[PDB]
Amino acid sequence: KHHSIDAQLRQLVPGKVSEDDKLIEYDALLVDRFLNILQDLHGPSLREFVQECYEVSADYEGKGDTTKLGELGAKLTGLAPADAILVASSILHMLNLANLAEEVQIAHRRRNSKLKKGGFADEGSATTESDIEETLKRLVSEVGKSPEEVFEALKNQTVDLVFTAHPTQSARRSLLQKNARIRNCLTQLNAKDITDDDKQELDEALQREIQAAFRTDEIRRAQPTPQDEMRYGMSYIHETVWKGVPKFLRRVDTALKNIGINERLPYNVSLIRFSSWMGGDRDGNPRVTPEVTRDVCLLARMMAANLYIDQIEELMFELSMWRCNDELRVRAEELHSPPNEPYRVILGHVRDKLYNTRERARHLLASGVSEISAESSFTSIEEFLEPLELCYKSLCDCGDKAIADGSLLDLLRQVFTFGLSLVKLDIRQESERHTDVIDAITTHLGIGSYREWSEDKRQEWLLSELRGKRPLLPPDLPQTEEIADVIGAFHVLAELPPDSFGPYIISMATAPSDVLAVELLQRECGVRQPLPVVPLFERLADLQSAPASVERLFSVDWYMDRIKGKQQVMVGYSDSGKDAGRLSAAWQLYRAQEEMAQVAKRYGVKLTLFHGRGGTVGRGGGPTHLAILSQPPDTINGSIRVTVQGEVIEFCFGEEHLCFQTLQRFTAATLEHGMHPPVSPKPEWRKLMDEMAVVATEEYRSVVVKEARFVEYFRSATPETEYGRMNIGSRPAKRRPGGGITTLRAIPWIFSWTQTRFHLPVWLGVGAAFKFAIDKDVRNFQVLKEMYNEWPFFRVTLDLLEMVFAKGDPGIAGLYDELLVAEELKPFGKQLRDKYVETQQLLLQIAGHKDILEGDPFLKQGLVLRNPYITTLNVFQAYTLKRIRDPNFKVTPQPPLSKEFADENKPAGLVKLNPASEYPPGLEDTLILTMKGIAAGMQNTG
Amino acid sequence: NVSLIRFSSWMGGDRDGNPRVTPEVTRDVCLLARMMAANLYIDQIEELMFELSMWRCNDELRVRAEELHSSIPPNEPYRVILGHVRDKLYNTRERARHLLASGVSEISAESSFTSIEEFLEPLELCYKSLCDCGDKAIADGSLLDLLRQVFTFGLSLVKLDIRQESERHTDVIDAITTHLGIGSYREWSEDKRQEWLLSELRGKRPLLPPDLPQTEEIADVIGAFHVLAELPPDSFGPYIISMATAPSDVLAVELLQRECGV
Amino acid sequence: NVSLIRFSSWMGGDRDGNPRVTPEVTRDVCLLARMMAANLYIDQIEELMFELSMWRCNDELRVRAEELHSSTKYYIEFWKQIPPNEPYRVILGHVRDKLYNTRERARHLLASGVSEISAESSFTSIEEFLEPLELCYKSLCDCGDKAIADGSLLDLLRQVFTFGLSLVKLDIRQESERHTDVIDAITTHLGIGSYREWSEDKRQEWLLSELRGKRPLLPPDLPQTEEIADVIGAFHVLAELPPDSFGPYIISMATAPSDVLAVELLQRECGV
């Protein structure tokens, strides 16, 4: 081929969105270079085919035929298995390149204050939100709080970001580094004062990096063990966050000086923390064994030690001073047991104790045992801090605090942020697995069946045991495999250091018994320092009952003694939305938070909420700013935890500057809310929300639960069946086979509908609710409009729906139907699509927008440039599903299209992603590729 | 295989009215015993290697001997297998050395002899191979001596008797009963004691609280049982109750043994 | 393979009017150079390991990679065993371990004069070091990835052909009369006469009679002053170190062809 992809992108976007907008030129730059590398490696006919694919798909977005995708499907059908994998591979790489360009454009975009319109709506986009200094200034200047009050608030604030597995692709450090080199070359190529020779060489470097990324095929490395999954998960901490935290904390120092506070934020401030679910969450995942949990704790300790060893070595090089404390001098010469460099000999000792600490962990991991003594290593953060604080005090004593406030201060901030394990591990298990244990205990003792007892009979008995001083768990207790897994986990918790763990989380929590049950089990299995117990209220019924549950827990003397004035509660968004639709789930959650908070205030407990997957707070790219500000008043008060989904971890943390802005907005929003809460809801707002909720729930359950043919439609129109059967997703897709959607799990629910571009779980029920309110009273349309403009809760909830509609396409969802759904159920499909378009139309009306995402052109531009690649994979997926499912459906087989090489074990190559494949060679790898790429393009939805 | 004569000892085991015999002393003396035993076996095996110079051997011995080649001379099969036994004996000894010095050993239990039966398998293999080849006369010499030594001394030379006073147990159980609000086992008649003790021994539910307030003496009693629980069974003989009076003194120790995890 | 630019050193080699610069000082700077060389290479190899994650390679590289999977713990990066489907990483990890041995051997020779770390475990010549690197270069090109080869791997190859295994080559310098002092000591000891008093032509005629002859000259019994022993000892140090470590032998205050041929004889008669 000859011509560039520039033209087909221009016709997708209505112009430049800012006058430093070079995104389309970036996209064209990288993919034009990719296609040339593709042509030189595999021949012009292959490169021409891939580019034609892209053009058909880009043109469909320009105006949605559907006729053109079917003939695209016709050509992709009948490619040989090797050519299908190569095409799918190339389109995925192009999509990755587009995302890299977008990161570069966001990172170096010149701030433009003229875009701000004032008010809370500005905090929904990165282009208009307020940095840490602007929010500090607003607090002192508009809210009227003292700089001293702001300084004190920051000192008592902690934001805790919780990392979770990616649903389709791990990221190794190697590739993150290949990503950074592609980004760096693109930035440097666009410098103003560029020489021709530098440009020629930077061009050759860019082509080189793109080809290296294309010939590693990280795409086709077959899904890793849970330990590897955790190791690759830490890559972003290694590559951006580790150096990011000290950089941002230094900007906080800058900001408070700029409001009159002339001292730095003390280095012992846990302003930001990081936690992990990888190796800890075992809810419905038996691959996560007690040994896996021990393994990830030891791995974390190794990686920490390595990062510290290198920081300390760079620090030794810098601190060549000779003037020092008396106390530092006595210790320096003690360790001489070059001497004129006292900071160097202290830090060299720390480095060796760090090597011991890492080797000890490596041995415990390999052998279960290590003769390397705990004496020889660092066993506490206190023992690690002592030498570093000695050096800080010494350098200040001799008048060089300026030096100490360089990288030594950075290192101290890193120790108080990451500790010795980088992240703390959350443990999670479902409530009935605990009931199974206790029921085995009660019947073995002949006490009865805890399963059959009332909720209050349970409470009465468990409180009798907890107040009692006599053990309970028999050592000869007959255990099943599941019961042994729960007991074994607790034994692993007992054997490991307390600072390795965060909370123990109870999935499907319903009643105070679920919490007290694990308190008992923790003690009875020998956890001498118990973990805090955290309920996860998922269903609507449980959210309704949640404030009562926690009030009865707070009414118990024993429990108040144990929790010492602090309680954590986790709330689920996608969980609750799967129960009774999103809109009702959102409103029930707001109220549950509201009521839990005053229950908490009444008993004098500090309540912390942990926001699970699917939350508006989870949109870490920018909208999280407004989403946090929109939380009910007095719900945060300096302490909050948020799930960082894998599908957005690259967008938030892949790039140095974006990592900075992600950390910044979480800390700013959280700080401001505690001193500047949102408007309290009006009565007519509540009343309308209440009535809308019943209509939305009834509409959601009428289609999802009460319609017999729904499940059969679901497994035809989506790749849900193949997602499960294939080698992706790590987990069993549902709890028991064949109980409908009830036993299906949140991730497959959202994943399967997002792949088809339909997004049913996010919006269903909302159209009925809006229509019901408009029809009930003509004045209700104006009150919903006012709610969207005046009530942050209502704005962020529909802003999410708008974004997911921007990511949807009824034509493509209909193509899945046309190909894969039985004739008798196609009318049901088009009725769901009728609900889709009716919901979108009224959502736009209430927001006052003419077309989707009017008012966020930046987000609109970023999404639309992905669709050419996503749509290509959508057509590929649909036709691959029909041939997978229908054994003698074919069309014309085509002669091979790519060129290279008689070297290669061609058959073994079609099957990299799952060599034990039970599907015909090439189909499983082609379907996984479409799934990976569609997931990469869609990122966060519901 | 006839244990016609055996040896035991009270040194490091008998603690009746002797507080310097602590749980750690008992752990030390059993580990020392295992080191001495290994040394005496290494010397016996080495002199036996010198002796067993012949090349004729069993089918079963021969493929074992050449298996161990894939790891001096090959044409001496009994020397190859006995050299392997010497190697593990060195491992046994060093592992005990490490457990004595640091409480834990990176020298794996598989690298060593953990049983008397594992140690006897190679030796009985030679005995059967010598006799199979018409060399029983040779087998009934030094090798027979060593087998009789294994069946007499084991891997600890002597087994360790444990001994402790009647009322030091009663003190522990009275601390348990008082703490749970049961009453005072100390004031109960012998019959009341028996009926309660069998209540607990027939029961399936644990008893000893982890938070139980212990005096130094009660802690010493509990700590001794924990050491017994952590060491191999073949290192010990009996638990002896001094000043024993009634069946409750016995059943009380049986309860405490179980409740401390032996 | 073009050494368009090279670097040399006088530090530890120039002893002209500088008795602080002893034979053992020369031995020491040569070993230090080899240590830092090894350290710079270990870092370059490690970051090259991070980059070369490809799985396609030629047949020769694959059989070699397979071999080295038949035998990585005391490093920070790549402490875990390296999978065989990452061939360039397997080869380069072996290169790193031979470089570690290279460095440790030099550290031991410096501390104790001897090292139980074999020369076989190490890189003793730059040709032995170049073979694994060029194997990766041609495999990368064999499989159509010359563009990748011409990245950091090409940088590393140019560094090997620029710096070698000693970073810099050492120039030795010493003044000409210190050599005449040596030769006069042995002409007098053997009863031949006094090389100092001979004219330039008599010196030449005699030096070349010895240079063309096949019989050794320097007695081990020779009465040496401290200055004479220093010149002799320097030559012995040259004889016991690898040739790649040195550049030229420079004669200060040179005046006549005798000054050159005298050092050529002393070089041979001290066993270089």
**C56 reaches A (C-beta below 8 A):** yes
**Per the CB < 8 Å rule, is A177 touching C143?**
no
Residue A709 · residue A825 · CB < 8 Å: yes
Distance CA A327, CA A333 (A): 10
Neighbours of chain A (3+ CB pairs under 8 A): B, C
Residue A345: CA count within 13 A, CB half-sphere = 17
Helix (H) or strand (E) segment spanning residue A672: helix A656-675
Structure tokens at A458: 């349970």
Instruction: Name the one residue in this structure whose structure tokens are 């030679």.
Output: B126
Size of interface A-B (CB pairs under 8 A): 45
**A173 reaches C (C-beta below 8 A):** yes
> C79 to chain A: nearest residue by CA?
A362
Contact list in A for residue B180 (CB cut-off 8 A) is 468-470
Q: What angle do CA B165, B170, B175 make, to 5 degrees?
A: 130
**Per the CB < 8 Å rule, is A369 touching B105?**
yes
Nearest-Cα distance to chain B for A451, in Å, is: 19
Residue A265 · residue A249 · CB < 8 Å: yes
Beta strands in C139-260, from DSSP E residues, in sequence order? 169-175, 246-252
Local structure of residue C14 (DSSP, 8 states): B
**Per the CB < 8 Å rule, is A469 touching B208?**
no
**Per the CB < 8 Å rule, is A362 touching C73?**
yes
Handedness of CA A815, A817, A821, A825 (dihedral sign): negative
Which technique was used to obtain these atomic coordinates? Answer: X-ray
Shortest CB distance from A306 goes to which of C53, C76, C150?
C76
**Per the CB < 8 Å rule, is A471 touching B208?**
yes
Local structure of residue A281 (DSSP, 8 states): B
Residue A208 · residue C150 · CB < 8 Å: yes
Nearest-Cα distance to chain A for B207, in Å, is: 6
* Three-state secondary-structure class, residue A921: coil
**Per the CB < 8 Å rule, is A216 touching C50?**
no
Distance CA A417, CA A274 (A): 8
**C73 reaches A (C-beta below 8 A):** yes
Structure tokens at A84: 């299908």
**A375 reaches B (C-beta below 8 A):** no
Residue A672 · residue A625 · CB < 8 Å: no
SS3 percent helix, strand, coil of chain A, rounded to 5, is 65, 5, 30
Choose among A493, A607, A636: nearest CA to A549. A607
Distance CA B163, CA A494 (A): 33
Give chain B as a DSSP string. Answer: ----S--EE-TTTB-TT-TTS-HHHHHHHHHHHHHHHHHHHHHHHHHHHHH-------HHHHHHHHHHH----TT-HHHHHHHHHHHHHHHHHHHHHHHHHHS--SS-STTS--SHHHHHHHHHHHHHHHHHTT-HHHHTTHHHHHHHHHHHHTTTSSEEEEEEEHHHHHHHHHHHHHHTTS--TTTS-HHHHHHHHHHHHHS-S----TT----HHHHHHHHHHHHHHHS-GGGEEEEEEET--SHHHHHHHHHHHHHTT-
Residue B152 · residue B179 · CB < 8 Å: no
| Residues of A annotated as part of the active site | 166, 578
Residue A703 · residue A710 · CB < 8 Å: yes
Shortest CB distance from A470 goes to which of B108, B204, B207?
B207
Q: What is the largest CA-CA distance in chain A?
A: 88
Contact list in A for residue C79 (CB cut-off 8 A) is 362
Distance CA B111, CA B89 (A): 9
Q: What angle do CA A548, A551, A556 make, to 5 degrees?
A: 130
Structure tokens at C77: 């990066």
Interface test with B, best of A441, A464, A469, A477 (most B CBs within 10 A): A469
**Per the CB < 8 Å rule, is B106 touching A363?**
yes
Local structure of residue A153 (DSSP, 8 states): H
> B213 to chain A: nearest residue by CA?
A469
Instruction: Name the one residue in this structure whose structure tokens are 């670097």.
Output: C7
Q: How big is chain A by its Cα radius of gyration, in Å?
A: 29
How far is the CA of A893 from the CAs of A74, A496, A887, in angstroms?
11, 59, 15
Distance CA C107, CA A572 (A): 60
Distance CA A567, CA A546 (A): 13
Distance CA A769, CA C234 (A): 97
**Per the CB < 8 Å rule, is A469 touching B179?**
yes
Residue A919: CA count within 13 A, CB half-sphere = 22
C-alpha B170: how far from chain center: 27
**A217 reaches C (C-beta below 8 A):** yes
Residue A400 · residue A322 · CB < 8 Å: no
Residue A562 · residue A519 · CB < 8 Å: yes
Residue A91 · residue A50 · CB < 8 Å: yes
Residue C147 · residue A208 · CB < 8 Å: yes
Q: Write the secondary structure of A402-432 as one string of H (helix), E (strand) and C (coil).
A: HHHCCHHHHHHHHHHHHCCCCCEEEEEEEHH
**A371 reaches B (C-beta below 8 A):** yes
In which region does residue A113 sit, left (phi positive, over 0), alpha (psi from -120 to 50) or beta (all else)? Answer: alpha
Phi/psi of residue C117, nearest 5 degrees: -80, 115
Q: What is the largest CA-CA distance in chain C?
A: 74
